[PDB]
Design an enzyme around this catalytic site. Structure first.
Site, PDB file in Angstrom:
ATOM      1  N   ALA A 149       0.383 -14.671   6.939  1.00  0.00           N
ATOM      2  CA  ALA A 149       1.232 -15.101   8.043  1.00  0.00           C
ATOM      3  C   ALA A 149       0.569 -14.886   9.400  1.00  0.00           C
ATOM      4  CB  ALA A 149       2.569 -14.371   7.990  1.00  0.00           C
ATOM      5  N   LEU A 183      22.923   3.986  -4.583  1.00  0.00           N
ATOM      6  CA  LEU A 183      22.568   3.435  -3.279  1.00  0.00           C
ATOM      7  C   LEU A 183      23.759   3.401  -2.326  1.00  0.00           C
ATOM      8  CD1 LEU A 183      20.178   0.482  -4.252  1.00  0.00           C
ATOM      9  CD2 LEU A 183      19.656   2.887  -3.768  1.00  0.00           C
ATOM     10  N   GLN A 195       0.823  -1.203   0.000  1.00  0.00           N
ATOM     11  CA  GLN A 195       0.000   0.000   0.000  1.00  0.00           C
ATOM     12  C   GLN A 195       0.863   1.261   0.000  1.00  0.00           C
ATOM     13  OE1 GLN A 195      -4.246  -1.413   1.832  1.00  0.00           O
ATOM     14  NE2 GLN A 195      -2.830  -0.469   3.297  1.00  0.00           N
ATOM     15  N   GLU A 247      26.027   5.516  -1.926  1.00  0.00           N
ATOM     16  CA  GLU A 247      26.268   6.824  -1.322  1.00  0.00           C
ATOM     17  C   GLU A 247      25.526   6.992  -0.002  1.00  0.00           C
ATOM     18  OE1 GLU A 247      26.539  10.139  -4.778  1.00  0.00           O
ATOM     19  OE2 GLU A 247      27.136  10.687  -2.736  1.00  0.00           O
TER      20      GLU A 247
HETATM   21  N1  LIG Z   1       1.823   3.369   7.431  1.00  0.00           N
HETATM   22  C1  LIG Z   1       1.171   2.247   7.141  1.00  0.00           C
HETATM   23  N2  LIG Z   1       1.214   1.184   8.019  1.00  0.00           N
HETATM   24  C2  LIG Z   1       0.552   0.038   7.731  1.00  0.00           C
HETATM   25  C3  LIG Z   1      -0.174  -0.084   6.555  1.00  0.00           C
HETATM   26  N3  LIG Z   1      -0.721  -1.321   6.533  1.00  0.00           N
HETATM   27  C4  LIG Z   1      -0.359  -1.981   7.656  1.00  0.00           C
HETATM   28  N4  LIG Z   1       0.424  -1.146   8.411  1.00  0.00           N
HETATM   29  C5  LIG Z   1       1.050  -1.457   9.703  1.00  0.00           C
HETATM   30  O1  LIG Z   1       1.665  -2.729   9.610  1.00  0.00           O
HETATM   31  C6  LIG Z   1       1.442  -3.483  10.785  1.00  0.00           C
HETATM   32  C7  LIG Z   1       0.732  -4.782  10.418  1.00  0.00           C
HETATM   33  O2  LIG Z   1       1.478  -5.463   9.439  1.00  0.00           O
HETATM   34  P1  LIG Z   1       0.907  -5.763   7.964  1.00  0.00           P
HETATM   35  O3  LIG Z   1       1.807  -5.180   6.900  1.00  0.00           O
HETATM   36  O4  LIG Z   1      -0.489  -5.210   7.826  1.00  0.00           O
HETATM   37  O5  LIG Z   1       0.861  -7.378   7.918  1.00  0.00           O
HETATM   38  P2  LIG Z   1       1.434  -8.215   6.666  1.00  0.00           P
HETATM   39  O6  LIG Z   1       2.798  -7.712   6.250  1.00  0.00           O
HETATM   40  O7  LIG Z   1       0.454  -8.123   5.521  1.00  0.00           O
HETATM   41  O8  LIG Z   1       1.595  -9.742   7.166  1.00  0.00           O
HETATM   42  P3  LIG Z   1       0.355 -10.684   7.581  1.00  0.00           P
HETATM   43  O9  LIG Z   1       0.354 -10.879   9.075  1.00  0.00           O
HETATM   44  O10 LIG Z   1       0.527 -12.025   6.913  1.00  0.00           O
HETATM   45  O11 LIG Z   1      -0.942 -10.054   7.137  1.00  0.00           O
HETATM   46  C8  LIG Z   1       0.589  -2.636  11.707  1.00  0.00           C
HETATM   47  O12 LIG Z   1       1.441  -2.028  12.648  1.00  0.00           O
HETATM   48  C9  LIG Z   1       0.011  -1.569  10.808  1.00  0.00           C
HETATM   49  O13 LIG Z   1      -0.128  -0.357  11.507  1.00  0.00           O
HETATM   50  C10 LIG Z   1      -0.222   0.983   5.664  1.00  0.00           C
HETATM   51  O14 LIG Z   1      -0.863   0.893   4.617  1.00  0.00           O
HETATM   52  N5  LIG Z   1       0.456   2.147   5.964  1.00  0.00           N
END
Ligand SMILES: Nc1nc2c(ncn2[C@@H]2O[C@H](COP(=O)(O)OP(=O)(O)OP(=O)(O)O)[C@@H](O)[C@H]2O)c(=O)[nH]1
Ligand SMILES: C=C1C[C@@H]2CC[C@@]34C[C@H]5O[C@H]6[C@@H](O3)[C@H]3O[C@H](CC[C@@H]3O[C@H]6[C@H]5O4)CC(=O)C[C@@H]3[C@@H](OC)[C@@H](C[C@H](O)CN)O[C@H]3C[C@H]3O[C@@H](CC[C@@H]1O2)C[C@@H](C)C3=C
Ligand SMILES: Nc1ncnc2c1ncn2[C@@H]1O[C@H](COP(=O)(O)OP(=O)(O)CP(=O)(O)O)[C@@H](O)[C@H]1O
Ligand SMILES: Nc1nc2c(ncn2[C@@H]2O[C@H](COP(=O)(O)OP(=O)(O)O)[C@@H](O)[C@H]2O)c(=O)[nH]1
Ligand SMILES: [Ca+2]
Ligand SMILES: [Ca+2]
Ligand SMILES: [Ca+2]
Ligand SMILES: [Mg+2]
Ligand SMILES: [Mg+2]
Lengths: 439, 428, 342, 54
Positions: free
Chosen positions: A99, A252, A15, A254
């Protein structure tokens, strides 16, 4: 021209990656179709932007990126999104079940079944590169995929690309937007395993981003979309030198050279200004002095900490917009005699400065206002170790009771890995203290 | 996209099971004919978690109805949404279990269990990625209790890497006066402690007291109780069938709620508490929802939360409201009563918000707590158990089905150990 | 209902502050490891400032200023005064001091040679006893090497103001409260810790007329409490003495200099310790110790970061701490301080 | 107070200002970790099936 490949892992990685590549397209004038009218040389070339985009005979500019998630739901939005034509299906990799916020599940159990696939997909991008620099890896600390699979990927990358550089963009967990109580576990485990494999990592605390959105953007309850568009601005400021003509941080390597004296202490603090709400009717444009001064305010940092009670090892100032060296030097002079800026004895008290005349590009309809000048400061200060302290304390509280540990042991991970990872973090805190603390 | 398989066993299990399906079918814009007439596209985004598809766009509940007698399953067919269920998913016998755990688990139920698994197997094969199962049943009877836990054990054997979730109705002398229920419940709890990942303790004791003291029902019916059960089951499954970030699947939920494997028995809560057919005139505010859902009188487990500590908590707010105010209110509760939350599990309270409200309400709140106060429930059951067992009273009803006394002693010992484990983390 | 935690059981001052907060019925004490607090009465050493201000929904305040040790360490204070241009050698109220390791050794020796061509000094460290007064540098240097930690060599005020009758040395303790806004509040009530044995220029070894510590005066002195109760004289009596003996006042002859020194020290380090834009807030109580020579010139001796209070003054000062440092941040349902404006 | 390495171009410019001078595991080993974890899983599940068989 040396190529850079971006790898986005898990929901946060994907995202955030979406936001970045959206911003890149706007900054380079690339359409969602992939067409870039200003590109006179069709089907190739070695311009600065080519480091992030490859080309086809039909004049399409596709990102040198791979998206990896153990669950399909998030990347499916990219497959059907407004930038669906931008990536070819090979770049978008997904599994069936995730996961489950479990490092061990993402690293060992599930990670073992898709790692060879991801590496082969990455190898295809590498083959398209005439001179690959290395990788930029986006991921969260807290997720099971972002934490567990990433560390597995970084280990494999060091093996298949022993000479290439690897930079991280890591999301540090924050309760206000967190989705798992075990994120402290996942953070420590992935940091331990990835530490020797990462050359320079930029941490972003969701807490800091959340509050900035509330405070400066007047957003009552910030969403991921709010957080990511802000994060993308910071990431853009940092990668701009790789994508545009310039002389500072051209490759990179640098980043490590200019920011990372000690290999383990490779976590630079990012500070950004100004953050202005688009909803505000008009706005007094801030000067070079004002935005520079704001770089030493904790409220503008990507990680809340107090750099006054630490030491600097390096400091880079990245300006975008109406800025000339003369005004920067004068701003620094004022600040140096005003604020507490201490460097380590074995380092020169100085700043490396890069200016890009092109002002910050903002997403049309976003919450960030257009400004005539912005700056991102990258400072390697020991003060960021506060974030390690906080994280380690939450680890200790739970691990003392062995809470949730059975979830990890059940995935094949040994309990001994917890204490090993923790002791590594314990040594890391000590390293920071040695460098930045005295009597 | 990750499918859940639903199983309802015995009289209680099928009654609350049917009431659950008609409620969520409504929320997802599904009529008794199985056709989608909903207006929102949110209702359909993750509707595959509980439903299957077909030509003509027919959404069929991934549910398996089980009983050792045809009675209750006859009632399910007759009244809606009785015809949404797949006909071949009705698995029933004729003998019954006679409120006897041994008959459900060892004799009568054993004869029917294979035909149930065949249907479970067919459903699991239609799933792109099965995540687990949910079972509805009572612990006081014979089929739901005895055959229910037999099913759980045989399902785990064939799907050892899947999540097992149950809605377990705990027996209460205020609602049913069948004398052997404490035996049946103690034998069942022994099974659940070993073979489920998540168990919602739906206590008929608490359900009765809510209907009597709060809803002012001098003579509450099972329809009244199931009204509370239904609302609760809808609330606790909201994050599974709607677009969300928190506890979106069974495994992520268990990982957030279960710090230790044996301690997976949750106290559910809900607000506002209402009666069927009774239209509430004034909708509650965010503050009111928050205070009520944490109120001891809003718990479905009949345990005083003040008598223990919360290990983990999940809160779900439904309807159009301010996320900011929700965050503020959930924060003050923790900050106001921080002592009741264990300090060695940081940030152990998670909050979710869904725009789509339940039927008849503009907004509501559902509470899911892993509290050490749940020991009171098992402690209540255990006392009723030992009073009889110390004299071997009514035991011949079980030894006649081939069971030995030792199996009772072991079950009792395990439940008592469970109580002591809760106590040790209450004093950590 | 505000919440706070106690992480220093040995603090008599904040033990009383803890009692007052509970007596309000609007404060609640939590377990010392409960993170959901409004106020932290932190420990003296290695207070985890890095874990403060990271609790959503909570405004957090702590009773210490991170970095204030620069002012409350004997070695630190010396280095601070010399290097800080706001103080520098333009400081006429701090005795000539040098930091010595078991380094300003050469510079101290050079100063020792010039004084010999009033040459009495004193050696002391941040870590009762542990002090030696001498006229010979070799004696002091041998002691510093004799001891373990770092010491500070300072010029000994040979001509202190002496109280009569008695002909005795003394020092002044001033309590200063700095709130979250960095308002500097001077407690109107100070105290004079007096020596019982008359000051003798000849014999330095008989450390009882030279050291005015409350402990030493009740363990090495036989005249303890004869002149004043507990060797503690307060401002009302001392003011009357100054008026009768010197025709001057405490405010004019001494207090003006004390306020100046206090303001100077704290304003100097303000940009380094201020929490104005921080994610957590700080306040702190300081104990300033002064000396006065025969010419009514006030000298700063040191600053205490974790000071105690006089028995009679506990009730008033600790209440003032709640009114100004705590209730100002967490309001409930004439002033004893002098605001040193800046 | 000295400026050095001033580089200019159409897109912008860069330089350095000095205010004051100074005072991996192999693929083999990785597989051995992943397969060792998988074996612990297989063992744990084997015990569950054995217990359920009893
Ligand atoms: N800044 C930001 N943080 C995010 C976003 N999506 C998830 N997080 C943060 O990431 C953490 C959760 O990890 P995720 O990346 O959602 O989980 P994952 O990597 O998909 O791994 P799984 O457990 O298999 O779903 C939490 O602390 C969320 O606040 C996002 O779009 N932007
Ligand atoms: C009668 C009947 C007959 C019928 C039995 C239904 C049922 C469901 C299954 O669970 C079992 C139970 O019910 C079992 O119920 C038992 C028979 C076997 C039957 O056996 C099984 C099955 O039969 C009978 C009861 O336990 C009825 C209760 C008993 O309180 C203890 C009585 C006071 C007591 O008479 C004086 N001390 O008030 C009754 C209070 C309860 O009424 C019921 C409705 C009345 C009840 O629907 C609603 C619930 C929500 C409730 C609150
Ligand atoms: N340079 C100096 N000249 C004259 N007298 C001095 C002096 N330095 C210290 N003293 C005397 O030393 C005594 C205090 O010792 P000092 O304060 O330095 O140690 P300390 O920190 O253990 C006590 P406290 O913290 O309570 O002030 C004073 O009472 C004073 O009489
Ligand atoms: N809440 C609720 N409890 C029920 C219902 N039906 C039965 N029970 C309870 O379940 C227990 C009886 O078990 P039952 O399911 O009828 O026996 P089974 O058919 O052999 O599983 C008693 O404690 C009843 O109070 C129901 O519809 N709702
Ligand atoms: Ca080109
Ligand atoms: Ca490497
Ligand atoms: Ca038969
Ligand atoms: Mg995910
Ligand atoms: Mg001292």
């Amino acid at each position: 021209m040396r190529e850079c490949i971006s790898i986005h892992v898990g929901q946060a990685g994907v995202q955030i990656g979406n936001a970045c590549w959206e911003l890149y397209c706007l900054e380079h004038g690339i359409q969602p179709d992939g067409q870039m009218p200003s590109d006179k040389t069709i089907g190739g070339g070695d311009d600065s932007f080519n480091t992030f985009f490859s080309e086809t005979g039909a004049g399409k500019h596709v990102p040198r990126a791979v998206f990896v998630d153990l669950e399909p739901t998030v990347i499916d939005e990219v497959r059907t999104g407004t930038y669906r034509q931008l990536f070819h299906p090979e770049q978008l990799i997904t599994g069936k079940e995730d996961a489950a916020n479990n490092y061990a599940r993402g690293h060992y159990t599930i990670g073992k079944e898709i790692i060879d696939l991801v590496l082969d997909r990455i190898r295809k991008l590498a083959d398209q590169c005439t001179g690959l620099q290395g990788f930029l890896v986006f991921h969260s600390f807290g997720g099971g995929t972002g934490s567990g699979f990433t560390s597995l990927l970084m280990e494999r990358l060091s093996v298949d690309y022993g000479k290439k550089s690897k930079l991280e963009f890591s999301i540090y967990p924050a309760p206000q937007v967190s989705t798992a109580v075990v994120e402290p576990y996942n953070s420590i485990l992935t940091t331990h395993t990835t530490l020797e494999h990462s050359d320079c990592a930029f941490m972003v605390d969701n807490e800091a981003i959340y509050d900035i959105c509330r405070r400066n953007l007047d957003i009552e309850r910030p969403t991921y979309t709010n957080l990511n568009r802000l994060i993308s601005q910071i990431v853009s400021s940092i990668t701009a030198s790789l994508r545009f003509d310039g002389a500072l941080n051209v490759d990179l390597t640098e980043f490590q050279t200019n920011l990372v004296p000690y290999p383990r202490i490779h976590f630079p603090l990012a500070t950004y200004a100004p953050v202005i709400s688009a909803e505000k009717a008009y706005h007094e444009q801030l000067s070079v002095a004002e935005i520079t001064n704001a770089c030493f305010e904790p409220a503008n940092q990507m990680v809340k900490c107090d750099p006054r009670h630490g030491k600097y090892m390096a400091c880079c100032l990245l300006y975008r917009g109406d800025v000339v060296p003369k005004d920067v030097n004068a701003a620094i002079a004022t600040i140096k005699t005003k604020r507490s800026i201490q460097f380590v004895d074995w380092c020169p008290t100085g700043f490396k400065v890069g200016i890009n005349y092109q002002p910050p590009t903002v997403v049309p309809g976003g919450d960030l206002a257009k400004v005539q000048r912005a700056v991102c400061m990258l400072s390697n200060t020991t003060a960021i170790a506060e974030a390690w302290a906080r994280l380690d304390h939450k680890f200790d509280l739970m691990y003392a009771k062995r809470a949730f540990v059975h979830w990890y042991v059940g995935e094949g991970m040994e309990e001994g890995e917890f204490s090993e990872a923790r002791e590594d973090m314990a040594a890391l805190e000590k390293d920071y203290e040695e460098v930045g603390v005295d009597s | 996209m990750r499918e859940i398989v639903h199983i309802q066993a015995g009289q209680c299990g099928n009654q609350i099971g049917a009431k659950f399906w008609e409620v969520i079918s409504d929320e997802h814009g599904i009529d008794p004919t199985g056709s989608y007439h909903g207006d929102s596209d949110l209702q359909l985004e993750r509707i595959n978690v509980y439903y299957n598809e077909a030509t003509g766009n027919k959404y069929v509940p991934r549910a398996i109805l089980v009983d050792l007698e045809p009675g209750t399953m006859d009632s399910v067919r007759s009244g809606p949404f009785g015809q949404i269920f797949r006909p071949d998913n009705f698995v029933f016998g004729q003998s019954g279990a006679g409120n006897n755990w041994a008959k459900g688990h060892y004799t009568e139920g054993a004869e029917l269990v294979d035909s149930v698994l065949d249907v479970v197997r067919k459903e699991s094969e239609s799933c792109d990625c099965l995540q687990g199962f949910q079972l509805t049943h009572s612990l006081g009877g014979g089929t739901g209790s005895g055959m229910g836990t037999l099913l759980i054990s045989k399902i785990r054997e064939e799907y050892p890497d899947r999540i097992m979730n149950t809605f377990s109705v705990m027996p209460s002398p205020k609602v049913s006066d069948t004398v052997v229920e404490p035996y049946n419940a103690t034998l069942s709890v022994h099974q659940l402690v070993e073979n489920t990942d998540e168990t919602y303790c739906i206590d008929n004791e608490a359900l009765y007291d809510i209907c009597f003291r709060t809803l002012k029902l001098t003579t509450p019916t099972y329809g009244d109780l199931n009204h509370l059960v239904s609302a609760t089951m809808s609330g606790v499954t909201t994050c599974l069938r709607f677009p969300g970030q928190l506890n979106a699947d069974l495994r992520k939920l268990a990982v957030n709620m279960v710090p230790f494997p044996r301690l997976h028995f949750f106290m559910p809560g809900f607000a506002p508490l209402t009666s069927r057919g009774s239209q509430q005139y004034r909708a509650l505010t965010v503050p009111e929802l928050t205070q009520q859902m944490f109120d001891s009188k809003n718990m479905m487990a009949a345990c005083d939360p003040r008598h223990g500590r919360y290990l983990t908590v999940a809160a779900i707010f439904r309807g159009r409201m301010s996320m900011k105010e929700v965050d503020e209110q959930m924060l003050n509760v923790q900050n106001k009563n921080s002592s009741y939350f264990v300090e060695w599990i940081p940030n152990n309270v998670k909050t979710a918000v869904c725009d789509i409200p339940p039927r008849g309400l503009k907004m509501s709140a559902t509470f899911i707590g892993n509290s050490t106060a749940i020991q009171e429930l098992f402690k209540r059951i255990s006392e009723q158990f030992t009073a009889m067992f110390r004299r071997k009273a009514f035991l011949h009803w079980y030894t006649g089905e081939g069971m030995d006394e030792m199996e009772f002693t072991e079950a009792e010992s395990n439940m008592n150990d469970l109580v002591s484990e809760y106590q040790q983390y209450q004093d950590a | 209902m505000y919440t706070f935690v106690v992480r220093d059981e040995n603090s008599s001052v904040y033990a009383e502050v803890s009692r007052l907060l509970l007596a309000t019925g609007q404060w609640k004490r939590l377990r010392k490891d409960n993170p959901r607090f409004n106020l932290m009465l932190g420990e003296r050493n290695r207070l985890p400032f890095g874990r403060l201000g990271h609790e959503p929904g909570l405004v957090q305040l702590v009773n210490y200023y991170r970095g204030a040790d620069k002012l409350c360490r004997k070695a630190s204070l010396v280095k601070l005064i010399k290097t800080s241009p706001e103080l520098s050698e333009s400081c006429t109220w701090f005795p000539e001091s040098y930091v010595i390791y078991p380094d300003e050794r050469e510079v101290f020796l050079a100063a020792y040679n010039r004084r010999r061509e009033g040459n009495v000094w004193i050696a002391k460290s941040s870590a009762g006893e542990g002090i030696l007064i001498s006229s010979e540098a070799s004696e002091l240097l041998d002691f510093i090497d004799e001891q373990g930690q770092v010491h500070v060599i300072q010029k000994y005020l040979e001509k202190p103001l002496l109280l009569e009758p008695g002909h005795r040395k003394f020092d002044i303790r001033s309590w200063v409260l700095v709130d979250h806004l960095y308002n500097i509040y001077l407690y109107r009530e100070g105290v004079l810790r007096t020596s019982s044995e008359p000051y003798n220029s000849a014999n330095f070894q008989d450390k009882t007329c030279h050291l005015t510590n409350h402990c030493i005066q009740k363990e090495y002195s036989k005249n303890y409490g004869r002149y004043e109760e507990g060797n503690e004289m307060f401002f009302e009596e001392f003011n009357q003495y100054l008026m009768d003996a010197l025709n001057t006042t405490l405010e004019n002859s001494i207090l003006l200099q004390i306020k100046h020194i206090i303001r100077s020290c704290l304003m100097c380090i303000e940009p380094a310790i201020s929490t104005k834009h921080l994610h957590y807030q700080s306040f702190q109580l300081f104990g300033f110790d002064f000396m006065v020579d025969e010419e009514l010139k006030v000298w700063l001796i040191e600053v205490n970061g974790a000071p105690a209070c006089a028995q009679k003054l506990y009730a008033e000062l600790c209440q003032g701490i709640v009114d100004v440092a705590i209730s100002s941040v967490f309001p409930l349902a004439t002033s004893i301080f002098i605001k040193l404006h800046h | 107070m000295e400026v050095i390495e001033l580089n200019k171009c159409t897109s912008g410019q860069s330089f350095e200002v000095i205010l004051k001078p100074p005072s991996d595991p192999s693929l083999e080993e990785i597989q051995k970790k992943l397969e060792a974890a998988e074996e612990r899983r297989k063992y744990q599940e084997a015990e569950l099936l054995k217990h359920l068989a009893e």
